């Protein structure tokens, strides 16, 4: 146990680092931030009046939920999991309820905002360096963790030498560079049959340039499984020239 | 006794704050929006550049005097239970710099208190002769963080044109430019705290996740033991409003009676 909790206790649960392959110490070239941060001034519309909100007097589980309507439909169930209706292959924007809404803090449409609740562990992989794995069975359609880091412009992103920790938001483009600041997500490797899917979300602000990226389970993840998502194409078109996917799956497109 | 609301905070706080009425027939106040955190309507440019943060490199629980954060606040004024030391100057309180996400230390170090939230058992209640008030339901040790004064961030320009100024609080006194918190349209339990000439609460300026020195946050600490059932109060600032409203705190030394 090279680290008992890489998050210095900021998260709800501890995320320990372990190594039983090589003799590398707990990674420490970065700053663990549990929430997104900015260096450059990024003007985000935190005008409260500009918030779309709902006036529900239920637990926002009726279809009168404005917040639910904005997201086409409240996609959450009673256990805070996605409905089987949820389009995994082309996910919609989700608008969770916010401090502007009339409803209570425990209504159905508050999930990603509550934080990560899963048991994760940073561990050393045989062939990919560091990786993240669950220590517990994860039901399908469960919110695992948020992709968090630094907010940068496409301008800023192109001049960045190290681009291995980036994530394109909307296509003007903004980015998250998890290189210098990030959370557990920065250590998640790629996979061609992924058990994780990114979903764009809005909570306390609805500035549509700056969605937050939540990973949901695409299937059951068994305790001990390593997480993975599809990095996309720009990665494996250039970086694929140098590296190569070693997901170890029958349908590896970038082997 | 009518429990007119089981929790005025819709569960945003760590504990529920219920409203009760056992004097007149007024329903739970509702011309405002309970926000647990400070908000802005107008764009207020606050420096949330992470690199602009002063931070510490403690590897302890920030209880050594090497604590940069502690140094900035002259001294970590907190004890192990998160209460102020008896050394704390009640009559002239310093700026406090709590530890932030930039620091090297853990989230449970000594110098994180106001940031953790309100933990005490409070209750919005109807007073006989002051309208609404806030009351503790439990003994409060002296030097305990009670609640934060929270609302809308507005300029002195904006504040002067505001008709209703009963819910204001001056932050950055002079320094060329002054900002305010107007708890009128958005606020928390603090907006209901009445004045008192022998106050059991004191405001203390604090910095946590940002150190933009125009925009301190205002934390109330207990100046003494508050017994379960006592109403809270602080000294407002009467300067003008006192030109007809006469204080009914009901203390022997009421200066605005
Ligand atoms: N499925 C995969 N197969 C091979 N290399 C991968 C991979 N997913 C990520 N990587 C490598 O991971 C690098 C950094 S991103 C992930 C962090 C890295 N695993 C670490 O040890 O900290 C990339 O440069 C990429 O080459
Ligand atoms: N010591 C005091 N005696 C009487 N009224 C007071 C008081 N301190 C504050 N108030 C009243 O509190 C008003 C608004 S601020 C606090 C809210 C107030 N308790 C309410 O009835 O909602 C002031 O305008 C003033 O009239
Ligand atoms: Zn809701
Ligand atoms: Zn709703
Ligand atoms: Zn809502
Ligand atoms: Zn592959
Ligand atoms: Zn600290
Ligand atoms: Zn320190
Ligand atoms: Zn510190
Ligand atoms: Zn008085």
Of B49, B106, B108, the CB nearest to A41: B49
Here the tokens at position B24 are 């007149």
Gap from CA of A99 to ligand 9 centroid (Å): 29
A226 ligand 1 Cβ < 6 A: no
Q: Whose CA is nearest to atom 16 of ligand 2?
A: B192
What residue has token string 């399908």?
A140
Whether B151 and B167 have beta carbons less than 8 Å apart is answered as yes
Resolution attained, angstroms: 3.3
Q: Are the Cβ atoms of A33 and B106 closer than 8 angstroms?
A: no
B129: left (phi over 0), alpha (psi -120 to 50) or beta: alpha
Whether A111 and A202 have beta carbons less than 8 Å apart is answered as no
Closest alpha carbon to B131 in B174, B70, B194, B177: B194
Upper half-sphere CA count for residue A17 (Cβ side, 13 Å): 18
Closest alpha carbon to B214 in B117, B95, B115: B95
CA distance B125 to B170: 26
What residue has token string 């609805």?
A206
CA distance A48 to B41: 5
Here the tokens at position A183 are 């959370």
CA distance B4 to B201: 26
Distance from CA of A193 to the nearest CA of B (A): 35
Is A247 annotated to bind ligand? yes
A33 contacts in chain B (CB < 8 Å): 50, 101
CA distance A183 to B108: 19
Q: Which residues contact B193 (CB under 8 A, 6 or more apart)?
A: B133, B134, B201, B220, B232, B233, B234
Determine phi and psi for B231, rounding to 5 degrees. -85, 145
Query: What does DSSP assign to residue A28?
Result: -
Whether A226 and A233 have beta carbons less than 8 Å apart is answered as no
A47 contacts in chain B (CB < 8 Å): 40-43
CA distance A192 to B192: 57
What is the side-by-side strand order in the sheet with A120-124?
A17-18, A120-124, A130-134
Pairing of strands A196-202, A94-95: parallel
Indicate the top mutation candidate among A230, A243, A253 to test ligand 1's pocket, ranked by most ligand atoms within 8 A of CB. A243
Determine phi and psi for B207, rounding to 5 degrees. -130, 135
Q: Which residues contact A51 (CB under 8 A, 6 or more apart)?
A: A98, A100, A205, A206
Mark which residues 180-239 of B lie under 8 Å from A by CB.
186
CA distance A70 to B154: 30
CA distance A104 to A59: 7
Pairing of strands B19-21, B2-5: antiparallel
CA distance B47 to A41: 8
Task: Catalogue all structural domains in chain B, each as residue range(s) with its CATH number.
Answer: 1-257 (2.170.270.10)
Q: Which residues contact B17 (CB under 8 A, 6 or more apart)?
A: B7, B8, B9, B122, B123, B124, B189
Closest alpha carbon to B81 in B149, B13, B143, B14: B143
DSSP chain B: -EEEES-TTTT-SSS---EEESSS--PPP-SSEE-SS-BBSS------BGGG------SSSS-STT-HHHHHTSS--B-TTSPBPTTS-SSSPPPEE---TTSSS-TTSTT-SGGG---S-EEEEE-SSSSEEEEESS-B-TT-EEEEE-EEEEEHHHHHH-S--TT--B-S-SSSS-EEEEEEEEE-GGGGPEE-SS-SEEEEEEESS---TT--EEEEEESS-B-TTPBPEE-----SGGGT-------TT-TT-
Whether A208 and A193 have beta carbons less than 8 Å apart is answered as no
For B19, counting Cβ atoms within 10 Å of its Cβ (0-12 exposed, 13-18 middle, 19+ buried), the class is buried
Here the tokens at position A22 are 């090589």
3-state secondary structure A37-73: EECCCCCCCCEHHHCCCCCCCCCCCCCCCHHHHHCCC
Determine phi and psi for B87, rounding to 5 degrees. -70, -25
> What's the maximum distance between 2 C-alpha atoms anywhere in chain B?
57
CA distance A244 to A247: 9
CA distance B218 to B181: 10
Upper half-sphere CA count for residue A55 (Cβ side, 13 Å): 0
What residue has token string 């194409």?
A233
Here the tokens at position B127 are 């007073």
CA distance B203 to B151: 15
What residue has token string 């934390």?
B219
CA distance A1 to A20: 9
User: Cβ of B6: how many Cβ atoms within 10 Å?
Assistant: 12
Q: Which residues contact B157 (CB under 8 A, 6 or more apart)?
A: none
Gap from CA of B219 to ligand 5 centroid (Å): 29
CA distance B24 to A113: 40
Q: Which residues contact B3 (CB under 8 A, 6 or more apart)?
A: B18, B19, B20
Q: Calculate the alpha carbon distances from B15 to A189, B8, B52, B232, B255 in Å.
A: 40, 11, 34, 18, 35
Indicate the top mutation candidate among A123, A130, A164, A240 to test ligand 1's pocket, ranked by most ligand atoms within 8 A of CB. A164
């Amino acid at each position: 146990i090279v680290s008992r909790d890489i998050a210095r206790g900021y998260e709800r649960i501890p995320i320990p680092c372990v190594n039983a392959v090589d003799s590398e110490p707990c990674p420490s070239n970065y700053k663990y931030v549990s929430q997104n941060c900015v260096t450059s001034p990024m003007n985000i519309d935190r005008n409260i009046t500009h918030l779309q909100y709902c006036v529900c007097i239920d637990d926002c589980s009726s279809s009168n939920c404005m917040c639910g309507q904005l997201s086409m439909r409240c996609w959450y169930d009673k256990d805070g999991r996605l409905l089987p209706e949820f389009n995994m292959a082309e996910p919609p924007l989700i608008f969770e309820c916010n401090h502007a809404c009339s409803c209570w803090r425990n209504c159905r449409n508050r999930v990603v905002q509550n934080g990560l609740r899963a048991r994760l562990q940073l561990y050393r992989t045989r062939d990919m360096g560091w990786g993240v794995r669950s220590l517990q069975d994860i039901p399908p359609g469960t919110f695992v963790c948020e992709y968090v880091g630094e907010l940068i412009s496409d301008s800023e992103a192109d001049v960045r030498e190290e681009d291995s920790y980036l994530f394109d938001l909307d296509n003007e483009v903004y980015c998250i560079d998890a290189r210098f600041y990030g959370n557990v997500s920065r250590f998640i490797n790629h996979h061609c049959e992924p058990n994780l899917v990114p979903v764009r979300v809005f909570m306390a602000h609805q500035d549509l340039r700056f969605p937050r990226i939540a990973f949901f389970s695409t299937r059951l993840i068994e305790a001990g499984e390593q997480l993975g998502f599809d990095y996309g194409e720009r990665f494996w078109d250039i970086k694929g020239k140098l590296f190569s996917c070693r997901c170890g799956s029958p349908k590896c497109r970038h082997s």
